[PDB]
Amino acid sequence: ATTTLTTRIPTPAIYPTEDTEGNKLTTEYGYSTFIDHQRITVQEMPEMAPAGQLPRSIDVILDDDLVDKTKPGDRVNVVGVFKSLGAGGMNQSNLIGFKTLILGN
Amino acid sequence: VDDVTGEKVREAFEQFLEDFSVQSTDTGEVEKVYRAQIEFMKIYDLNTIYIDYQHLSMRENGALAMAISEQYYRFLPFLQKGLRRVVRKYAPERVFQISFFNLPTVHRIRDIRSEKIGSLLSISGTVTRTSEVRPELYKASFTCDMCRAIVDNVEQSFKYTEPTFCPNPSCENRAFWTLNVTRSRFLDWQKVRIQENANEIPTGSMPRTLDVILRGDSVERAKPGDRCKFTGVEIVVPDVTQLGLPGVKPSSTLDTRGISKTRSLGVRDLTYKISFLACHVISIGSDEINELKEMVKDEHIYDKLVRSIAPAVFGHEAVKKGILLQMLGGVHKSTVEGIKLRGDINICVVGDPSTSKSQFLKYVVGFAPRSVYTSGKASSAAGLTAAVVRDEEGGDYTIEAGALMLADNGICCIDEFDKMDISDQVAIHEAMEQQTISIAKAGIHATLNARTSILAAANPVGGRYNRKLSLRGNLNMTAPIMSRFDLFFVILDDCNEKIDTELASHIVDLHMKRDEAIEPPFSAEQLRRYIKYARTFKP
Amino acid sequence: TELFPPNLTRRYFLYFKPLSQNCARRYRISSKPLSVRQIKGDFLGQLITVRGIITRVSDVKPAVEVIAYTCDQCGYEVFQEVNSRTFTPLSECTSEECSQNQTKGQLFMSTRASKFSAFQECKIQELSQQVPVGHIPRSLNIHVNGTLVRSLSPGDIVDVTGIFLPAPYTGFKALKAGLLTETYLEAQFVRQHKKKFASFSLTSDVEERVMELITSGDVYNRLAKSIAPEIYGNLDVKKALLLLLVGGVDKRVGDGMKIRGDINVCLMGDPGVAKSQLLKAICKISPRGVYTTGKGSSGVGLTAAVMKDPVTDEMILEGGALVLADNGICCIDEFDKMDESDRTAIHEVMEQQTISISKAGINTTLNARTSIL
Amino acid sequence: LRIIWGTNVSIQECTTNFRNFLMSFKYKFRKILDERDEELYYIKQLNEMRELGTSNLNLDARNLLAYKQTEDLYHQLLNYPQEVISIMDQTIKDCMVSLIVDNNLDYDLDEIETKFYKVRPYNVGSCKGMRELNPNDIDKLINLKGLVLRSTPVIPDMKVAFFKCNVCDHTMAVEIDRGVIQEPARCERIDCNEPNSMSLIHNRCSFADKQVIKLQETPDFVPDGQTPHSISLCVYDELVDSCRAGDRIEVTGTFRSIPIRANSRQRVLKSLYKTYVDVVHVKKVSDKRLDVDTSTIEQELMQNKVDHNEVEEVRQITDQDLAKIREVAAREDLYSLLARSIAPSIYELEDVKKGILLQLFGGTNKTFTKGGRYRGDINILLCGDPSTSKSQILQYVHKITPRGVYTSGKGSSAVGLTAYITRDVDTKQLVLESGALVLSDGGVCCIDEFDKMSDSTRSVLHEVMEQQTISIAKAGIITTLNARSSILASANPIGSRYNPNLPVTENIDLPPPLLSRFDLVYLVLDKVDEKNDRELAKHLTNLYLEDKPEHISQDDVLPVEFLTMYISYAKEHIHPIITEAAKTELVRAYVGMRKATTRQLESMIRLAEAHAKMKLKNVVELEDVQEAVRLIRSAIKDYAT
Amino acid sequence: PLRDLDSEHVSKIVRLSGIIISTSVLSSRATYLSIMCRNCRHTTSITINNFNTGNTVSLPRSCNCGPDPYIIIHESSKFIDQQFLKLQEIPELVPVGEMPRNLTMTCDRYLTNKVIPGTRVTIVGIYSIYNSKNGSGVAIRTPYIKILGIQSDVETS
Ligand SMILES: Nc1ncnc2c1ncn2[C@@H]1O[C@H](COP(=O)(O)OP(=O)(O)O)[C@@H](O)[C@H]1O
Ligand SMILES: Nc1ncnc2c1ncn2[C@@H]1O[C@H](COP(=O)(O)OP(=O)(O)O)[C@@H](O)[C@H]1O
Ligand SMILES: Nc1ncnc2c1ncn2[C@@H]1O[C@H](COP(=O)(O)OP(=O)(O)O)[C@@H](O)[C@H]1O
Ligand SMILES: [Zn+2]
Ligand SMILES: [Zn+2]
Ligand SMILES: [Zn+2]
Ligand SMILES: [Zn+2]
Incomplete structure (x- = not known):
């Protein structure tokens, strides 16, 4: 996938x-x-955030290259494709929808 | 073999139940009562007959009893019918329970040995929990899903699901059935938890516990927190959590020889615990009125009681009165509004160390049947107040007999009271601002009854009693918990040579074997039973 | 015929060691001692050298490589090779005599005919000075087989040489993107930069290294000045630190008494006359040397923790500094900024070689055998 | 020639070789073994056993190592024990019968034909515990020295299974073979067949007793790096309730391995095997440490008979030893002979050593048949200067006493002095472990840095110091449990060193009542001078004259192995009655202190009666109070201040 | 008020009020998906308009090529955001004896992110019934509301 x-x-x-x-x-x-496979999870930058609300975060998958150039707590910009992969619910059996993530390019 | 022998024992045991019939006539020769007890049991359908085992042992020179008690669970099906067919012919919706009691010995449960499995055994200890009385399936109807055919004859202890024959042999699969909930027998069933006797634990071992189960009219005859005695069956029960223990575990398998060309291999692990199944219970541990009347008619008995409510303590009439009075109640429901009152009496004992104030708590816990003792440092609110077991073992929740729920209608000896924390003393005072106790966890909310007296032993901030201070300052327990004490007793000590030689003599004279130095006017043999006559007096 | 295989008659365990740089530059690669960060993944398969702190080890226990099974009705043995972490019992008899037979009679395992190996494993954490700026000393998992097994002990720095390999694990099903692998290093040979005193025998290269040190004379003053020569003078202190190492003699009375054969020392003073540099210098020169600090973790850090051991279903005591060090030097700094719960652990250890605990699941008496500087 | 597969054992050749030894051994180890009267050395012990019914043959394995013709066997039973002991079971029965047929005899035959005989081989070589037990050591004889922390309930384990048949009125039984119950599908066809319908009935079956025990293991040497291991071991029938929490033990058995099921769902087995000891022998006692209180353990001394095992509980002594004991007791200076030989490396301090000796004897223990109990003890504290015996005395007590946990400082608090509840990870259930004092239900509990234990912790001992019991009310348990421990304490004053210009009651920094509830308090101040410290220095440096102090036999003192045989006799066998004539000197000694509390009086009787355990006197005499009171006064230098 | 909700009028429109506690995550549901058979190399499309457990739709059981033959062509499919809310009875007016009760609440498309936890609201909704994988009674269902529109006090705090 x-x-x-x-x-x-x-x-x-x-x-x-x-x-x-x-x-x-x-x-x-x-x-x-x-x-190398890696996933890193990015949550909204806290000074732009409409403060008081909860954090919201999404999962970024990195291929072989960029694996070395992230670490927790740093301010990071990513670009990629926000794929919506798998087939949860509609295949197999039962709700929670599709697994959504970014392919980090 | 015993498909033969069992009938010979049935004929033997029914003969014991036949060749004996009630004598004792004119207090002369004796011959066992059982037909007269059956002719009593005729009225009530209770079917809960009690047999004295000592009366059984003399027939057959014991060779019946020493056989049956060892082989018991294999002969029990024949003894119960050995009753029925006697009942069917001395007497005209039927279940039975049978007990043997008064066995010759008591076996401490540390000496439970698997060599006794399925045998009759005598046990005693402390009951730590009871549980919700529940139906046990016993005989039940089972209906085929394939046709309206049913079976009521049962397999029931385990394996309780699959009778081997359908009253029409043809089925597209014969072996499997569904139960019915409507046409079934049921019997009342209970589990209680029993604990080793603290008088007989090994050195450094913990108080071993084991699970003991009740059937029929023996149900609801155990009571938490007290000594009990049992007789019954050394059952064994499957246990899973023994996985991960050392040694091989025996695994069964269905053989593969003589069937051909037809966990799919068919295998099981048979690892067991040793519970117990008890048929009899008692709460172990005439001319009486001619003594009770005899004492109350006499003028001095109060002063005799004051100098006998703790025979070994020297002087201290004050605390002796206090404790004697603490064993006696006051009318709690003394209101018109329909809210009750703190009818019971609370006491605190205070003084510099090496006062014998702690001895009283040992005497009381040695003497007052609804009493218990705590070190008061080694404690928690969740051990004084009842804990809960969280809906485990597939049943619902159960309440754990906390030490201060226990000692209802009596005294809790809270030794070294002041070393408790803020948490549990407030738990107490919330259980003194109300007689009731309330508990919450897991959303299960329970309010317990309680009604109790506390006997507290306490120590000054520096042990030495400051004569020149108020008790609030000296004692260092906050005013609300210093409230709700009817009296404080305070003791101060110094050299008073006329006494010190009499005290020193009293200590050393005590160290002559069981000597009369502490002989009271009269002993517990009447004092406890007199106190019960005093309780139900309600003046 | 059908026969016992030669791997099941294998009398011995075989291992490799690489060639040092000397043999790589002589006759002009094979073993750079890599950082755990530097390993970059795609070395899987290779023989590699890695160095770092062995933080944690399991105890040695048997792990099976072959299961031997006994069949009565055949008399043929059945051998099952075990390769993964788990196996299922080959209960259905595979024998060459029962295959072409109606009855397929049962078999039972033999727990000595089953070829084992001694299995042990450890974490190596990154060697801190090799960590990048801002980054963390991440960890790698090492598996050991056979005769090598006790060569790794915690709290020491080693070169490990061995073969770096996948293991089948991925997360927990959903946290996955297919055909992931865990990875481990199968240890082959070990050398360690601070050596065990217990191995010290004399051979053609070590005696002359002692003798050439002696013959210049004044050895005691030569070694004192050779301790921490990067700080000025004060030889009497550094001259005593050499005695702290050699420590004197342990005495057993032959009658149930023991008295410490060890030196305990304090370096009281004012700022500016360096202290931690001498503490740090003796931590390097001491095998099993350890360095400590006044405050924070030091309650447990000077004590046995208790831990549910990750690899196998048992509790273990985990040693704080006075137990991660033994037969060696423990260095304490900011000393008086410790607290009573720390001192009452220390005060017992100077007096005698042992510690005692009696809280919660811990009741042991524990051997310290440490010098406190 | 016959041989077992995978094995070097010939049945008949070992059979005759064992008989050849069994009918000819006479202490040849004394002749041969090293540089160290009797005859027929085992035949007396075999013809001993047959009338007593004690079916056990406890075997000193090193008999074979020294002997000329069974070096060929020592390395077999060590390495093939499951099979070699299975031979011994047969040979000993045939070797009992040879002592029948050579005898004109009564009917021993009618049972020993059927009964079974066994061997417990224990006297084997030392090992570094679990750690040196590499897999080459699997399934070999082993021994361990250590102690017990907990023991499980008795487990039922199948030995004959039973089958009940849902029809046709025939059951079946099958004996277990090597861990399986091969249940017959066929209904025992010859009666009739039904394919699958048969039951298995639990309560008809025959079971072994099994028990599991957790051993804290303590090697004679441990490598630098190690930490204590909680081994788990299993014990079978005739050893269940042999040994229990706090016992110090040498145990022997077979080192084993076993898989574990990964889960309760399916038969996948972990490949990284678990390991344990199958116990074959346990040596409950040693010559170096005294004997567990026979009054306390009275419940189990009969259980050993009722259970039919002779796994010994108490040291055996011969008449040649008791004759020496009595001839020693007559001497005038026993009162100082023990007080020297108790610590041959500790200088002077004979006031301290002597009261400690009188702690070890205990004194007298008594009860009122239901309502009360009293016990012989003295609880001790040491105070004054550093640099003195205090810490070393706590070791020598610990290494003589069969039981006791050396608690220390702030590292010891309530939840681990009394009992605690914990998750047994090996099964994942809540279970109860005995705390330090509970493990010490007997002997001595030895406490150090006593004043640096917290205000909260001290409150447990405040009950235990005379009431010798602890009482609990926390979740899962409500009980009072026994804590028969004597207590001994090391303490240091307020500030440092000592300061005679402040009263001792303040200087100790321990509250007046707890200080009173100690039965004896020792003031051990240094007060330096020449002609004492010089004599001390010579004594110490003689320990470095010879690099092991074998010449310590100078300045004559008892062998410890005799001293422990004395105390474990006197302790076990004398109940010294405080005579009614002793009061008149006792009360004046108390009142003279009063011109202080009954604890002194309650101590003096428990101390003076110990001074009658010493010299073995059934009754106390007016003299023995006189040394006891002087000891109390001089232990705190009462004449000075 | 929730206290007056009843099995009466299940699946009618209901008007009720409370406080939003929480707002979960903008989960992703389909509204167009394009699908190919991995064996028949055969394409269809499916649409869903309004339903967004035991309801709505699933991929067709078969189009032999056997069960579950279908691959979702994600790169030619359209999806929508929905959200899970919880509303509880305002703690200012609830039984003294116990905790408030609450309702699982859901909303779709532009109705998402309109509301912030802790605002005071009136919901108009379909009081509806679903099955919960509990672990509750012998046979039972759980109530929920599909929001079909929302309004509030003009801005809370
Ligand atoms: N009047 C008395 N009667 C009996 N025993 C006494 C008396 N006074 C003191 N004692 C002694 O006190 C001890 C009981 O301990 P106790 O003084 O109650 O401790 P605490 O003062 O801490 O409560 C007993 O050993 C007993 O010998
Ligand atoms: N006598 C000296 N010779 C060489 N370097 C010194 C000397 N004294 C101090 N230094 C320098 O000062 C530092 C010592 O700091 P230090 O005094 O140990 O901190 P602390 O105050 O904790 O002891 C070292 O970095 C060292 O380089
Ligand atoms: N009078 C003495 N006789 C024998 N050994 C002594 C004496 N005084 C001191 N020692 C030695 O000193 C050490 C005692 O340390 P110790 O004084 O117990 O620490 P603490 O000061 O905490 O008691 C032991 O090794 C002991 O052999
Ligand atoms: Zn049918
Ligand atoms: Zn085979
Ligand atoms: Zn049949
Ligand atoms: Zn298709």
Whole structure:
């Protein structure tokens, strides 16, 4: 869900513990490739806030790059796409609506 | 084997219930009463018959009793029918309860051993809680969801859901049923919590507790906060929380041999607790009126009581009067408005340390049956006032017998009173500004009854009594809680050689084995029962 | 035939150690001692060196790698390899004699034929001087197997060399974006920059390092001046700090009595004649040295906490400074700005080697064995 | 040649080798073991057991290590105990029967044919507790030295299961095999079959007793870094209620491992195994520390008979020891011999040592058959200068006394002196743990920095100091519980050092009443001089003349191992009656103080009767009060000020 | 007043007043969603106008391609904000013996963020019934109000 902006058809592929022919396998950890995932939650800046009210906050997901350049308590501007992903309620069974977040670009 | 032997014991036990019939005639030879008790029980349908076990042991040279008491739960189905068919022929909507009592020994529950499971056993201790009396399913109708066929013959203790046959064999699945709530028997059921006797705990062990359960007309015969004695069945009950304990846990499985080509493997963990099931209860621990009348007709008994309300204490007639008077009430409902009054009497005992003021509290708690004792430092409001157990074990909530809800209609010995905090003394004074007590947690609000006297022992700010100060300053307890005391007793000590040699003699003379140095005019053998005659006098 | 596998007959545990920079520059990479921040994730798979404080360890306990099962009706053993944190019992007999058979008779585990390994784990927190500006010393999880297991003890600085690997965990289902992994380091070899005194045997390189120190003579004054030479003079103080380290002799009476073989010292004075620099200098030169301060946490900080141990379902006592240090120096500063609850812990520890507690779930008598400076 | 799988054990070869030892051992360890009369050393102990019914064979394992022909076995039972002890169960029965058939005998046969015999091997080597027990040590003999903090209720565990059949009037039973109950689906077909209908009936089954115990473990050495471990261990039938909270113990058994279920829902098991000890023997006593009060523990001395176990509770002594004890008691200077040998490294202070000795004896304990109780104790305080025995005395008491928690300062408060309620994380339930004084229901509770304990905490001892009981009313518990402890305290004055220009009652900074409710108060001021401190300095430095003080036998003093055998006799076996003639010298000594309160009188009788436990006198005599009162007056230097 | 609410007139319009305690989060609900079958490669669209548990709509059970075949094409779908409010009877006038009671209250589109917690209001609403995953009685439902408009004292404090 977080690698393309368009809702690509899901592909729940299965981690291969056996070959197509049926043989055993072992894992070449570090010929495999990895990427950092992080989410950071941003709440409204308290001096612009209409004071007295509660804080309100939303979840930002960062790919490999920007992971190193946020820390809690700093004033931060983000830009991204406010995706509304999953299918809560209308699929599966039951209310609370869709999971809303920003893809931080 | 005992599909054979059980009938032989039924024929044996029913014979004990037949070859004996009431004698004692002219106080001569004796022969057991039970038919006369059944002919009494005829009137009431209570079906709650009591059997003395000592009368059972002499027949068959004990070889019946030593068998039955060991094998009990396997013979109990045969003894109960061993009653029915006697009743069916000396006598013409039926359930029974049967008890054996007056067993030869008491086993302290620390010496409960699994070698006794299912056997009869004798137990005693302190009841710490009771619980809401509830229906137990017993015999109930079960109806098939597939057809109107029903069954009433029951499997009931556990496994209570699945009779194996449907009165028409064909079903698209035969094994499973639904219950009915309408056509069922039920019996009243209760759980009570019992605690080890503080006179017999091990060194450094805590007062062990165990769960004991009641059925039938024995229900509502336990009372919190007091010594009780029991007899009944060493039951065992499944317990889950023993997971994570050391040692292997036995797991059952259904075999796999001789069935072929047809937790899906079929497995279970059978880990158990040892509760107890009790059939008999008593609240352990003529010529009387000829003594009660005999004392009140005499002129001095008041002065005898003053010098016998605490025999070992030397002098201190003042406090002796106070405590004797504290064991006696005043008319609380003495109003026209329909609000009651603080009819009971409160006392505080004060003085420099090494006064025997603390001994009185031990004597009282040794003597006054509705009394209890607290160190008053080691305490909390939630232990004086009743706590609550929060809706646990699938039942509803239950109230926990706090030490000051207990000692209704009597004395609480609050030793070292001043070392209590502001919190619990105010909890007391809110329970003295009203006789009632109120509790809130979890939205469950309860107002308890209370009506109590407090006996408080207190100590000056510096222990030494300042002769030159008011009691408010010396004693350092705030005026509202210093109010609502009918009297304060104050003691001050110094060398008075004419007494000190008599006191020193009294202490050392006490250290000769159980000697008469503290012999009263008369003893508790009449004093407590006389006090009950005094209570119900209402002058 | 079907046979016991050679991994189940494996007499021994095998480990690796890297090559030091000397061998990298000689003949002209392989082991930079990385920061826990510097690890940048995508090193998964690699053999890496990391250094930092071992803040917390579990106790060693067995963790199974293979389960051995016994089948009577076959007589064949069944061996199940255990790889994840959990397993399910292979109760249905897989044997080659029951497979082509009607009855599939049962089996029972053998708790000594089951190949274990000694399992231990620790946190390393970042080494503070390597933290960036404004940032926090974050932590990494290390797993240990076999003979290495006791080489890590809390409150010490180490190089860990080992292989850095994923573990299957992600959060709690909703707080997820697919195929996340936890990560851990499987420890292979250890070296530690302040060494354990208990290992001290003499071999071809250490005796000459002692002998060349002796032969110049005046060793006692040479070492006093060599303690904290970055502060002026006052040798009598620094000369006594060398005795604090060597400490004298522990005496046991052979008759149920013990008297402290250790030195306890105060550095009373006015401002400007440096104190914390001497305290800090002796914290570096002392293995197991520790540094403390007057106020804040020091009640628990000088005491055993009690903790529900994260990795396994038991409580543990967690040692404050006087217990995180032992057989070594505890340094106290701003001293009189402590309080009675701190002193009445300290006052017992100078007098004797032990502490005693009797509040809540704690009733122990606890070994201190610390020098207070 | 026959051999067990995975194993080096031959049944018959070990069988004959054990018999060869069992019919020929005679203290060869004294000859062989190191540089250290009798005969048939075990045959006397076997022909001892058969008339007593005590089925247990307690075995000193090191008999085998020294002996010529069973070094081949010591390293087997140590490493294969579950199997090697299963051999011993059989060999000893056959080795009992060899003592039948060689004897013209009565009918011992008709039961020992059927009954069962067992071994409890305990005398094994030392180990660093839990910590050195790497997985190579799984399923081996082990021992632990330590103490108990709590014990669970007795647990029912299945040994024969029972099956009730919903039809057709036949039940079934099955014996448990290695943790499973293989329940038959088939209805015992030959009667008839129904596929699945059979029940399992709880109350028909046969159960073991099981119990679980929590051990605070205390090694002879611990590595720098360590902290106390609460091991959890299990004990089976014939050991249940053997040992309990506050006991100091050597225990032996098999180190084990077991999985844990992750949850009550499904059979997924944690791979990081749990570990415990299966107890096989517990050594309830030692030679170095005295014996638990026989009056207190009277409830369990008969329970050991009623439960049929001889796991010992009290030190055995032979006539050759009691004969020596009585020949020692006759000497004129026993009153100072003990007071020296109680602390051979502590100089002078013999007023202090002697009253402490009279604490350890207790004195007399008495009751009125329902209504009252009194006990022999003295509660002690030490005051005056630093740099003195005070802290070391509290250790020697602690290391002799079988029970007691060395509480200290502000680090010890009410919730942990009396009992507290806590979550047992290993099962996640509320459970009650005995506090420090409750664990000390006996012996000594040794308290230090007594005045730096808070105003709130001191209020518990203010009841306990003579009433010897604590009474509770907090959530979950309402009880009064026993706290039979004697109490001993170290204190220091107001300010520092000492200051004779202020009255002691002020100088101590302890309130007048609590100070009075101590039975003896010691003033231990230094008052320096030559020809004392020089003699002290020589004494101390002789401890550094020889780097372990083996020459401390100089200045002759009792072996501690005899002194504890004396006290644990006198304590156990004499109930000294305060004679009616002793009053006349006693009351004047009290009144002379009055020209102070009954606690002195109530102390003098409890102190003077201890001075009759010493010298083993059934009755108090007019002399023994005289030394007791002088001790009270001189302990506070009453002549000076 | 809430004290006079009854099972009488369930799903009529109701006028009532109180204090708003809290205002939760602007949860996101659909109003247009476009949907493709992951096996049939076949597209539809669904709209919902007004209903915004046991009600409204769900993705169609099937369009073989079996159950739950449908992917929501988020990047060609339109959504709306709704909010959860709680109103309680004004503490100035409630039983002396117990706490006030309150009602779950919900609102949609432009009606969101009009109100601040602690303002005094009159609500016009549909008193309506829903099922709560309790843990309440043997068979029961929970009341709620769908706000269909709102007004206030002109500005509180
Ligand atoms: N008149 C008396 N009768 C009996 N015992 C007394 C008397 N006066 C003092 N005592 C002694 O006082 C002790 C009881 O303790 P107590 O003086 O009540 O403590 P506190 O003064 O703290 O309440 C007993 O051991 C008893 O020997
Ligand atoms: N005699 C000295 N030689 C070298 N540096 C000194 C000396 N005295 C002080 N300093 C400097 O002053 C600082 C010492 O501060 P310090 O006096 O220890 O604080 P405190 O007042 O807590 O003791 C150090 O940074 C050190 O560099
Ligand atoms: N008279 C003495 N005899 C033997 N040892 C002594 C004597 N005086 C002091 N010591 C030694 O001094 C140490 C005692 O410390 P201690 O004085 O107990 O601390 P505190 O001052 O708190 O009591 C012990 O090691 C003890 O051996
Ligand atoms: Zn049917
Ligand atoms: Zn098999
Ligand atoms: Zn059948
Ligand atoms: Zn489709």
